[PDB]
Amino acid sequence: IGTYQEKRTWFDDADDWLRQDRFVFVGWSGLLLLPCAYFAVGGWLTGCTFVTSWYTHGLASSYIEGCNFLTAAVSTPANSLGHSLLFVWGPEAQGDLTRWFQLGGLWAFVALHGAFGLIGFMLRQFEIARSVNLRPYNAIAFSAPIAVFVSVFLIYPLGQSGWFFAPSFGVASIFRFILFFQGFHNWTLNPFHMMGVAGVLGAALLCAIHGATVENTLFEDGDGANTFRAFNPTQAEETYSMVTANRFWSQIFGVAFSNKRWLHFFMLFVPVTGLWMSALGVVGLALNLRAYDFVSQEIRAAEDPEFETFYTKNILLNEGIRAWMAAQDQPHEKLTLPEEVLPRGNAL
Amino acid sequence: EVNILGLTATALFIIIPTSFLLILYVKTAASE
C-alpha cells in the first residue's frame, strides 16, 4: 500500500477471500451480519411458531396455541424482570433453555441479534460501497431505520419500567404497542411524530410521482409498443425527458425539479429526516416527556362546560383506552378495577 | 393576558433565520 513492499500476512489472504464476488457477498461485515441476522429471523420465526407467551404476559402468541401470522408474536419478558438482558447463562434462566423460552428470553435474543444485524448490515453497505467505489448514501439513508429501531426497541423500554413495555416482535403485538402509545402518550399530538408522518407520506408521494413522471416521459427509443425493451444501458443518453417533465410539473403544480441531483437528494432526504424526527420523539416519550395536553385548552374547558374540541374528544378517548386497557394489559399492576369506576359514555 | 414568552420565542425564531437567509440571498445576488 502506497508503493511499499508490504510482506503478506494472514490478513491479506483473509481480505482476499472475504472480498470476492459470489452468489452472496460476505466481507468482514458478514462475520457479524450473517450470524446475527440469521439468528434474529430464525428466533422470530421460532417464537411465532412454538414459544408461548402464557408465562410473562398471560396470553397465547404462537402457532402451537391457535394464533395466526397476524396474531402470533415473540413477546417481551415480564415487567418484574425489568431491563434484565436475559442471557441463557444469566441469573434468571440459569442455563435452562426450555425455561428461558418461557421467561421471555427469546425477545432479548431477537432484539440484541437484530440490533447487531442492523449494525453489520450498514457495515456491509459501507464495505460494498467501498468495493465498488461509490458514495455510501445508502448507509446514510439506512441510518434512519437503525435510529428508529434503537429508539423504539431499546431506548423507550430502557426509559420505561422494563422490556415488557417494549414492542413484542409481531403484528397484533405492534398494534397493541401503537394503541398503547395513542392512549397513554398521545403520540399523534407529538410534533416529532407529525414530522415523521409528513416524511413518510411525502416520501411515498415522491416515489409515486417520480416513477410516474419517468414512465410518462420515456422518449421513443424503439418501435414496439412495449417501452421496457426500448431501454439500452449501453447508450449514454438519458432515458426520459427532464425538460418535458419540468414543464409539465411547472404548469401543473407551479414548481418542478430542474436538477436530477436535487431530485434524488430530496428523495433521500425526506424519509430519513422524517424517521429521525420520529426517533427523537420516541426518545422524548421514553421518559414520559409527552406532548399530551394543551394547558390553555384544558383550563378553558375546565372553566367552560360548553367549550369542546376534537382535541378534548381525543383526550377523552385516551382516558378510555388507558382505563379499559390497563387491567388486561399490565398483569403486574394487578388492576382489578370494577366496571363502575371505568368511564362510560351513554348506552354503549 | 398575553403569553409574552411564547410571543418572544416565536418572533425570534421567525426573525433571526429569515433575516439570516435574506442577508445570504442578498449578498449572493449582489455578487453573481
Binding site: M242, V243, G254, S258, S296 | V2, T10
Partner: peptide
C-alpha cells in the same frame, strides 16, 4: 395574541409558496 400569531404564520407560509410558484428562478439545464 393567540389567533393572530397563527393567522400571521399561515399567511406567511401561503405567501412563501405563492412567491415560490410565481416569482421563482427560471429553470436552467433541463
Amino acid at each position: 395574541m393567540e389567533a393572530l400569531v397563527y393567522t400571521f404564520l399561515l399567511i406567511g407560509t401561503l405567501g412563501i409558496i405563492f412567491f415560490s410558484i410565481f416569482f421563482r428562478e427560471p429553470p436552467r439545464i433541463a
